[PDB]
Design a binder for this molecule. Sequence first.
Ligand code: F38
Ligand code: ZN
Length: 209
Amino acid sequence: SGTILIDLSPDDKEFQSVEEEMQSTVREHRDGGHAGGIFNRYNILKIQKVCNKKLWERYTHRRKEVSEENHNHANERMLFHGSPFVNAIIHKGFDERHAYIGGMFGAGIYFAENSSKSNQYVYGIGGGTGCPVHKDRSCYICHRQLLFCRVTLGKSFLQFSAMAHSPPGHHSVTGRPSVNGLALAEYVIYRGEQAYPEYLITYQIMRPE
Ligand SMILES: NS(=O)(=O)Cc1ccc(-c2nc3ccccc3c(=O)[nH]2)cc1
Ligand SMILES: [Zn+2]
């Protein structure tokens, strides 16, 4: 594949800032925990930097294209992605196989500001049948993985709300929450080259006291 994973020390500022983004963007979900489990915080077990020259150059090439189409503004974010295919993504990159075909903004690749939103997809859409070992969507034992990804949004189409093409004249879609005042935005891209899987985070959800 060309992918190397470099472990970050918990003493490293980079580990600490990624962990803080993970922990601080947990929220409660309208499903009461059905899909992703019941928790307020995680036990972070490992954070690895994902290093792949080809995939990075694929990303920066597309980033430049988007920037040049948007007054030299890539509108780059760091966003979470959860998927049963995390280990394929880090080796091969994002592509049409990683799209949410039934997503509310069409068939594209979905990312979240709330880590807990991406956690709902670690075992599949709706949490699937939960962890493979115990069949438990709220498993507190099994190790989960999320990606913290560098994403190029460019000019993003704003959708107020409660693989396809991006809307004409746009590079992405932003799903803005219109009902749940505590929810953060979600984003969709329609080209795998617009995201790079920068950090692989291994964690457990923690049972509340
Ligand atoms: N196509 S598939 O076979 O890879 C199944 C799949 C479906 C949905 C996701 C997914 N949906 C989201 C929706 C909103 C916000 C964040 C996410 C996210 O991180 N992942 C991941 C994988
Ligand atoms: Zn389990």
